[PDB]
Design a protein around this ligand. Structure first.
Ligand SMILES: Nc1ncnc2c1ncn2[C@@H]1O[C@H](CSCC[C@H](N)C(=O)O)[C@@H](O)[C@H]1O
Ligand SMILES: Nc1ncnc2c1ncn2[C@@H]1O[C@H](CSCC[C@H](N)C(=O)O)[C@@H](O)[C@H]1O
Lengths: 386, 386
């Protein structure tokens, strides 16, 4: 059949390229889908695609993805239902739906095996992002249209006056509201254990950027500001095991104690630091900010940069590792993020020119930009004092 | 470039087939996307694809899609913002996101024109379907995971005990509650103006099913039970304009009122009738139920059928026009519908065997099954007395 032939050739093209080529193919397949659906199909697609997150959250509550990924033969719906404690008819209907969207696979004797998506949802860090989206993002998006209608469609600029405050009936911003929320801290801390791949070290020419700087007598090579579990520090020490200089993970105390389990015995310091205060480490080569500034409106993002600038020597650099969407033709993964951080945080995705304008207000100029993902661009941008 | 070549060749294959083949290709493109995405891509897709309904809702509130679909030239974001009463920065970011998911088209000089999806969302009945998804379906899906956990995963069979009651904090079932909400019933009435295509008359062998039936003296040929705007009656009269016999649209008076604008001035009777009460028309050739019975659990669906059966002749037929999902390999459109109607109405999609089991409890037997859509199957099922 022509359908089998299409799948075979796209599969073969996909395996004949790298992860960025496969991402480009997937965006093309998505664009083809939208161009080819009928009007009624469009409305059905938009209506039913919301089911995926709800049904993933149920499968996660039942432990279904973890169980199915460990099974060694196809499982019947009754076997899964009786094992996980689910009603037989309910489980059979959830599995039929999951099979239709490849969350599981259905065999021709109507049994079930894991798919690539089953394996994904069984990973704690990824499972946690799905649960984050259901419990924290969905309420904000559900509130955005009426929030904007009430306020007469304002440009959102303040983290304490956006859809989040209407959706959760609070007056705090996300950061502070979450502390008051037991169940959501546990999922968030699990979320921080996910490590995105690839990372900036795949294209960052660290030796070229070192240049005229010296680690002697005891200077810091790398200060990871808000570095979470410290994945950037770990990958840096791993890739450049012979480069001298302190490598310092900076974050809040509760996150730093969680990171102790995973950090190496030696080579990475843990330093409690609130990045809304002056940077304590002086003259470091790289002050590193990964997925930090995108969570803040320009006013607060600027204050974070101004808190680092007085610690910089002439050879110091601020490295912002973040999304850099293009000026036109932006893709859904970076425009969707923009709407979400608008609605929850009052912040925004920034083009290269918007990053430069923000950094110029802190006294900085862009020296170099090292993309490491495509077609949705994440880049390490290297800034020095003007 | 490979991506351009894939789009060219899929587009050419799509143009060469019919709507059923294009739907087959679209399901295959979806399956390829899901198998080719990375684990991180899966979570981002699940997370962000719900932005689409939220942003469509906003563009609907602003009249954006209706406006853009009437525009004779590309519009800048500033021109749209100022025309529609939206903040310029807000409108720019919404348009960028809409273009990235083909809800509009962005030009090379960063202006905006209608896409196929813009035109769809400008259609009142299709727009109303999207607004229904946002305001009615979304809160029920949002409530389903916690509802199932509280009741430890029951099999849902009661229309007054499902996620709908939790989501809207009421003890009414969905049908009664909707009537007490003026803006929601108003949207619903616009929703009824959308006419699905193709319809059952494309494969229904009317003359063979009629045989020698005579309309003499006063008999009805076609009774459209819960017929809405009467599309099935209108199409029947248009395709067989010389077939004698009355054609009767039965619904509740508020819906029949909205139908008068569209009905032909002669040939179709509007008869108020509650299908939970005994059927007034005796001895009709066809009692027609399109997309009625899937809205009810088996007990209440049985009673609707039992209200008709005493009116039937030996020649009378009940025609159920509804989804007939396969025993295996069902598609996302028909399984996702099953999960939505579970959560909001306590009902279910039914396989052919499940329809026959239900209809036998009313003393009916299946005589013919006429599919008219593929690969998601809708069929007219013709039942007679045992
Ligand atoms: N005021 C503050 N001072 C220092 N760290 C903060 C902070 N507010 C939030 N954070 C931290 O900022 C991080 C945001 S997510 C961390 C992402 C990390 N840079 C990475 O790419 O791996 C969290 O670890 C959180 O604990
Ligand atoms: N108790 C009742 N008696 C008669 N009609 C009812 C009813 N409850 C709901 N309805 C009607 O049933 C219809 C369901 S949707 C309409 C579907 C229609 N058969 C078609 O496909 O074209 C609505 O028009 C609604 O007004």
């Amino acid at each position: 059949e022509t359908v089998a032939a299409i799948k075979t050739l796209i599969q073969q093209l996909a395996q004949s390229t790298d992860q960025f080529g496969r991402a480009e193919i997937n965006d093309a397949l998505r664009e083809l889908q939208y161009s080819l659906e009928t009007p009624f199909d469009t409305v059905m697609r938009m209506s039913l695609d919301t089911c995926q997150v709800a049904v993933a959250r149920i499968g996660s509550d039942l432990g279904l993805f973890k169980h199915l990924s460990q099974c060694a033969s196809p499982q019947s719906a009754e076997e899964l239902a009786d094992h996980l404690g689910c009603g037989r008819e309910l489980m059979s209907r959830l599995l039929r739906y999951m099979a239709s969207v490849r969350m599981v696979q259905q065999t021709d004797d109507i049994k079930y095996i894991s798919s690539n998506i089953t394996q994904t949802l069984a990973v704690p860090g990824l499972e946690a992002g799905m649960r984050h989206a259901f419990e924290n993002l969905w309420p904000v998006l559900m509130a955005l249209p009426d929030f904007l209608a009430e306020r007469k469609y304002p440009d959102i600029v303040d983290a304490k006056d956006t859809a989040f405050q209407k959706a959760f009936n609070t007056d705090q911003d996300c950061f502070h509201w979450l502390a008051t929320q037991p169940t959501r801290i546990a999922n968030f801390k699990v979320l921080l254990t996910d490590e995105r791949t690839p990372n900036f070290l795949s294209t960052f020419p660290l030796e070229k950027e070192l240049g005229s700087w010296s680690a002697e007598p005891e200077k810091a090579l790398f200060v990871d500001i808000g570095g979470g579990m410290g994945h950037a520090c770990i990958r840096l020490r791993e890739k450049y095991p012979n480069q001298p200089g302190r490598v310092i993970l900076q974050d809040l105390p509760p996150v730093l104690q969680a990171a102790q389990a995973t950090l190496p015995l030696s080579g990475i310091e843990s330093m409690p630091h609130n990045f809304h205060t002056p940077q304590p480490v002086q003259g470091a080569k790289f002050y590193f900010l990964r997925l930090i500034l995108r969570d803040f409106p320009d006013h607060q993002a600027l204050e974070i940069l101004q808190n680092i600038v007085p610690a910089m020597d002439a050879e110091s650099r601020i490295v912002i590792d973040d999304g850099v969407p293009p000026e036109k033709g932006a893709r859904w993964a970076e425009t969707g993020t923009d709407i979400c951080i608008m609605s929850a945080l009052g912040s925004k995705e920034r083009t290269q020119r918007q990053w430069e304008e923000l950094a110029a207000k802190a006294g900085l100029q862009l020296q170099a930009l090292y993309q490491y993902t495509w077609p949705v661009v994440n880049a390490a941008m290297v800034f020095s004092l003007q």
